[PDB]
Design a protein around this motif. Structure first.
Motif, PDB file in Angstrom:
ATOM      1  N   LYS A  88       0.824  -1.204   0.000  1.00 58.58           N
ATOM      2  CA  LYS A  88       0.000   0.000   0.000  1.00 58.58           C
ATOM      3  C   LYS A  88       0.861   1.258   0.000  1.00 58.58           C
ATOM      4  O   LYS A  88       0.747   2.105  -0.892  1.00 58.58           O
ATOM      5  N   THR A  89       1.729   1.400   1.003  1.00 61.99           N
ATOM      6  CA  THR A  89       2.562   2.596   1.089  1.00 61.99           C
ATOM      7  C   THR A  89       3.684   2.565   0.059  1.00 61.99           C
ATOM      8  O   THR A  89       3.962   3.576  -0.597  1.00 61.99           O
ATOM      9  N   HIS A 119      -9.415   6.466   0.546  1.00 59.92           N
ATOM     10  CA  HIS A 119     -10.184   5.250   0.314  1.00 59.92           C
ATOM     11  C   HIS A 119     -11.688   5.480   0.391  1.00 59.92           C
ATOM     12  O   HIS A 119     -12.452   4.584   0.016  1.00 59.92           O
ATOM     13  N   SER A 169      -2.384  -1.231   7.990  1.00 57.54           N
ATOM     14  CA  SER A 169      -2.045  -0.764   6.654  1.00 57.54           C
ATOM     15  C   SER A 169      -3.329  -0.410   5.902  1.00 57.54           C
ATOM     16  O   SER A 169      -4.421  -0.363   6.473  1.00 57.54           O
ATOM     17  N   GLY A 170      -3.209  -0.158   4.601  1.00 60.25           N
ATOM     18  CA  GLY A 170      -4.346   0.194   3.779  1.00 60.25           C
ATOM     19  C   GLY A 170      -5.017  -0.952   3.060  1.00 60.25           C
ATOM     20  O   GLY A 170      -6.078  -0.757   2.458  1.00 60.25           O
ATOM     21  N   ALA A 171      -4.439  -2.154   3.110  1.00 54.53           N
ATOM     22  CA  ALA A 171      -5.038  -3.293   2.424  1.00 54.53           C
ATOM     23  C   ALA A 171      -6.281  -3.802   3.140  1.00 54.53           C
ATOM     24  O   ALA A 171      -7.219  -4.272   2.486  1.00 54.53           O
ATOM     25  N   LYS A 231      -8.968  -1.120   2.636  1.00 56.45           N
ATOM     26  CA  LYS A 231      -9.455  -1.293   1.273  1.00 56.45           C
ATOM     27  C   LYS A 231     -10.300  -2.553   1.147  1.00 56.45           C
ATOM     28  O   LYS A 231     -11.241  -2.594   0.346  1.00 56.45           O
TER      29      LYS A 231
END
Lengths: 686, 257
Positions: B65-66, B193, B216-218, B221
């Motif tokens: 993600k990052t 997001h 994290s962003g996963a 998401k």
């Protein structure tokens, strides 16, 4: 609800039961019914039944349009003569009258070739003007002139949606899916509604397509009445073709009201804005004149440095790097480097005389012949450079005026229905010199003079070059470049029968049959004629390995607009000629990643003709990823044509006929280096 | 070899450097670092330096993600080269640096590209051969015989896993640090997001940026995807608050399991 109370009401065939039962169906007809109109087996007796018979016809066309029918739906309405934002009118009018009048206009448009369909079409026209759902009732009423009164009846206030949407998708589907005469109705009616409306530049594109003298007059008195200037002068001169700028300068010289359209009618006011604005805000690097002008050798890479040297027309150092550079250069390079002075002096008309005069009246005929070529390239509206070359014209074998004839006749062809250039070109074509490029630059000269004419002409010009084309069957390169100018004269129209006249008086041995298929190439600029696409696939497998290259090379010209159909399986074949067909058929477009993807495989080849032909389209389609293919050629080569051609690809890297003729003439590079002397004088570049 | 296909992606994602905020300097450092060669060359070739090594970064969130949000800046209009995970060396016998030679020859034939090494856990996960093929990876990665060809951008998760010998040859241009995403970076990740999607008015933010802890962003998401589909089950695009907390329970359970 349930059909218990209303079900036994339609069975009686009496008049009162209908005159009160049918108004209940009109009341409850807001959403049609509660179901899919299963009462067909009970109203099929009312089919034969009839006081309020227009309501019986209205309900009958309502149910027949409700479940299914093909022809019997619009009959109760063409006999009904309807006279008796809700959901009722939207349902029974919008979709039912949309498909209804659509199939009525389709059946009446295909079956027969009165005014009932006109009253239905205007009734639906107004009713759908009230409905305000664009492009759909329109996209259905395209095929039913009535379109003129439809547009002038509809184009009153909605200009952005009907012009942008209707003209955008109806113009795209009008060059793709609509034949020629209805497109001409688009041109005339669009001249009407767009003449009465704003957005002049789209009418200027309608002048690029119409090529009529009245549009530029009304748009110059209207653009003159409505008060920048140099910009619309720039793309005004770019949009206009060869006919309407000499006709434009003769009508503006006939009116002489302001002389500013006369000033904008020539090449001066299209170049005086560009050159200083380009030199001021942009600064080109000198590492390509110094580098690409430093790694040259073998007397050919230096020619690539003469072309890259010609790229400047900011920095004029490599141009003015002393003298003797042309003296050390060979003839093949004396002509090209002699035209380099013409390429580097596109502006500074007054300076061209004092820059080229130093090489004029010299001892070598090629230096001053290429100097007259320079004088013909640097100017296109000055017409004060022809006299020293046009004067003598009296050798009849060779005295400085066959090469000077190449220079001033070719450069004059680039500078230009002028009669007193062809009265002098009559002994030029009639000379029949053994040199190919004499008739080359002659047929290209008069051909580029006669581009976009009034549907061409079958006069003694093309008749003379055809008779003298079939005079002697030697040096078939004449048969390879005379159809260039022939096609330049046939260019500008597809429906004309001049191609069939060539199919009458030209059909012979495959030489003039290749001439006939070149006339077929340039006589099909593009329309909806897919018969030539299936015929294209039919004749695609001809044994003759050149009419495939040209007749199949026409693909980039025929479908030049719809670029989605242009990629095909030509690369999957085994014939190298077909690989050349796709490789040249890529084009000079913006260069999407799919094109470079095709060049990643088309680039790697072993033949010097195809490896020489690939950087032309690879580097013409991309004018980030510009240095990778050059490194690729450095890894492949490290012949002379590959190195000179990759340096010329370093030249290339960093709807008019002027951008179509030069490379179409360049499609015959697979011969002696004499053609490479005409390669250095292209005008299709930007 | 099917493993070569899953190495890099050949698509052009629309995610640019202007779609994320807060780290504008941190993204303009790598943008200015690797976007100067081969693009906008008047500040690169006229100076006469040419350090064809590129920066090496590391994302504490990681999971693509990052690190893919920083590497995605170069993916706008350019060719890209992706390497994720050190499993490709450990999932087979010790063939050696031949795969690195394949990436070096496809990178040679694809010079206008960006080398992105992700999930660098070679020594962190025979074992004696991993150290010598990793030191050989540093040897061939240094570019001892080749000129400026491609910019290599390495990306690991823990800076302590890499040996001190892998720093001086590899990292020679510049390195930086990434802050901790506790409340404001997770608020910006939540905004990005939840920028295209539609959310209700009662959807609060403090509980969403409070219940998370080192995420994290996963996964956010993933709950935006299953929240858009779960809310899409009722043929509606609006994501209610109770359904986004019902999808937030997947976040609360996933990190705790």
């Amino acid at each position: 609800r349930d059909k218990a109370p209303v079900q036994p009401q339609q069975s009686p065939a009496a008049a009162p039961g209908g005159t009160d039962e049918k108004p209940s169906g009109k009341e409850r007809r807001d959403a049609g019914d509660k179901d899919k109109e299963q009462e067909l087996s009970e109203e099929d007796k009312q089919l034969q039944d009839e006081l309020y018979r227009p309501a019986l016809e209205e309900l009958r066309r309502q149910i027949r349009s409700s479940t299914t029918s093909m022809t019997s739906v619009p009959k109760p309405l063409k006999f009904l003569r309807p006279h008796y934002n809700k959901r009722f009118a939207a349902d029974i009018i919008s979709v039912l009258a949309m498909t209804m009048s659509g199939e009525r206009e389709c059946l009446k448009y295909r079956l027969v070739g009165a005014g009932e369909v006109a009253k239905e079409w205007q009734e639906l026209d107004d009713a759908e003007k009230v409905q305000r759902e664009p492009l759909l009732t329109l996209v259905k009423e395209i095929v039913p002139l009535l379109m003129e009164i439809e547009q002038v009846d509809m184009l009153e206030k909605d200009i952005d949606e009907n012009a942008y949407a209707k003209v955008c998708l109806y113009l795209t589907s009008c060059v793709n899916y609509v034949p020629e005469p209805e497109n001409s109705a688009l041109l005339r009616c669009a001249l009407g509604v767009f003449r009465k409306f704003s957005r002049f530049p789209e009418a200027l594109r309608l002048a690029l397509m119409l090529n009529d003298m009245e549009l530029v007059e009304d748009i110059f008195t209207s653009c003159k009445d409505v008060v920048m200037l140099g910009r619309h002068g720039v793309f005004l001169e770019l949009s206009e073709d060869v006919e309407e700028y000499e006709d434009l300068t003769e009508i503006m010289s006939n009116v002489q009201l302001n002389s500013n359209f006369l000033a904008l009618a020539r090449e001066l006011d299209i170049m005086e804005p560009k050159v200083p604005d380009d030199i001021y805000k942009t600064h080109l690097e000198n590492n390509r004149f110094g580098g690409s002008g430093s790694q040259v050798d073998s007397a050919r890479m230096n020619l690539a440095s003469s072309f890259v040297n010609g790229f400047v027309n900011q920095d004029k150092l490599l141009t003015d790097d002393g003298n003797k550079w042309l003296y050390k250069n060979k003839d093949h390079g004396m002509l090209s480097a002699a035209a380099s002075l013409g390429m580097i002096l596109l502006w500074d008309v007054d300076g061209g005389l004092t820059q080229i005069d130093k090489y004029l009246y010299s001892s070598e005929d090629y230096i001053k012949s290429g100097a007259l070529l320079a004088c013909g390239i640097v100017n296109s509206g000055v017409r004060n450079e022809c006299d020293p070359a046009l004067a003598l014209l009296s050798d009849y074998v060779l005295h400085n005026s066959n090469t000077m004839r190449l220079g001033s006749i070719f450069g004059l062809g680039l500078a230009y229905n002028r009669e007193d250039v062809l009265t002098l070109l009559l002994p030029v074509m009639g000379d029949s010199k053994s040199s190919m490029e004499v008739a080359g630059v002659t047929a290209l000269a008069c051909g580029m003079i006669a581009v976009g004419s009034c549907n061409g002409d079958v006069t003694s010009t093309i008749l003379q070059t055809i008779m003298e084309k079939s005079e002697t069957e030697l040096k078939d390169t004449y048969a390879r470049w005379l159809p260039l100018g022939l096609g330049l004269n046939h260019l500008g129209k597809g429906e004309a029968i001049e191609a069939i006249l060539a199919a009458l008086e030209v059909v012979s041995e495959p030489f003039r049959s290749f001439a006939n298929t070149l006339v077929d190439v340039c006589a099909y600029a593009g329309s909806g004629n897919v018969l030539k696409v299936q015929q294209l696939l039919h004749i695609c497998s001809e044994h003759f390995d050149s009419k495939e290259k040209e007749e199949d090379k026409d693909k980039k010209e025929k479908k030049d607009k719809d670029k989605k159909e242009a990629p095909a399986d030509m690369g999957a074949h085994q014939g190298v000629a077909v690989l050349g067909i796709a490789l040249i058929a890529m084009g000079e477009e913006i260069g999407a990643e799919m094109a470079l993807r095709t060049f990643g495989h088309l680039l790697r080849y072993g033949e010097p003709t195809l490896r020489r032909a690939v950087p032309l389209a690879l580097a013409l389609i991309s004018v980030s990823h510009d240095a990778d293919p050059e490194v690729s050629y450095n890894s492949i080569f490290a012949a002379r044509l590959a190195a000179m051609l990759r340096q010329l690809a370093q030249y290339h890297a960093k709807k008019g006929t002027l951008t179509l003729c030069p490379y179409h003439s360049d499609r015959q590079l697979m011969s002696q280096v004499a053609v490479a002397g005409l390669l250095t004088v292209l005008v299709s570049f930007l | 070899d099917p493993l070569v296909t899953v190495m890099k992606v050949e698509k052009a994602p629309q995610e640019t450097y202007a779609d994320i905020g807060g780290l504008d300097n941190q993204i303009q450092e790598i943008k200015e670092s690797v976007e100067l060669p081969l693009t906008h060359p008047e500040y690169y070739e006229e100076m006469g330096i040419k350090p064809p090594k590129g920066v090496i970064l590391y994302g504490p969130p990681g999971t693509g993600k990052t690190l893919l949000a920083k590497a995605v800046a170069n993916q706008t209009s350019a060719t890209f080269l992706r390497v994720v995970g050190s499993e490709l060396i450990q999932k087979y016998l010790g063939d050696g640096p031949k795969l690195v030679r394949e990436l070096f020859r496809v990178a040679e034939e694809h010079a206008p590209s960006i080398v992105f090494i992700d999930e660098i856990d070679a020594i962190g996960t025979g074992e004696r051969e991993i150290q010598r093929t990793m030191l050989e990876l540093l040897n061939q990665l240094d570019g001892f015989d080749s000129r400026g060809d491609v910019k290599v951008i390495m990306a690991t998760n823990r800076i302590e896993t890499l040996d001190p010998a892998l720093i001086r040859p590899g990292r020679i241009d510049r390195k930086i640090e990434f802050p901790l995403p506790d409340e404001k970076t997770k608020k910006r990740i939540f905004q990005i997001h939840t920028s295209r999607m539609t959310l209700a008015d009662d959807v609060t933010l403090d509980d969403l940026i409070m219940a998370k802890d080192d995420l994290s962003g996963a996964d956010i998401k993933a709950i935006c995807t299953e929240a858009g589909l779960m809310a899409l089950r009722e043929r509606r695009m609006k994501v209610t608050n109770e359904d986004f907390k019902k999808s937030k329970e997947n976040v609360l359970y996933k990190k705790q399991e």
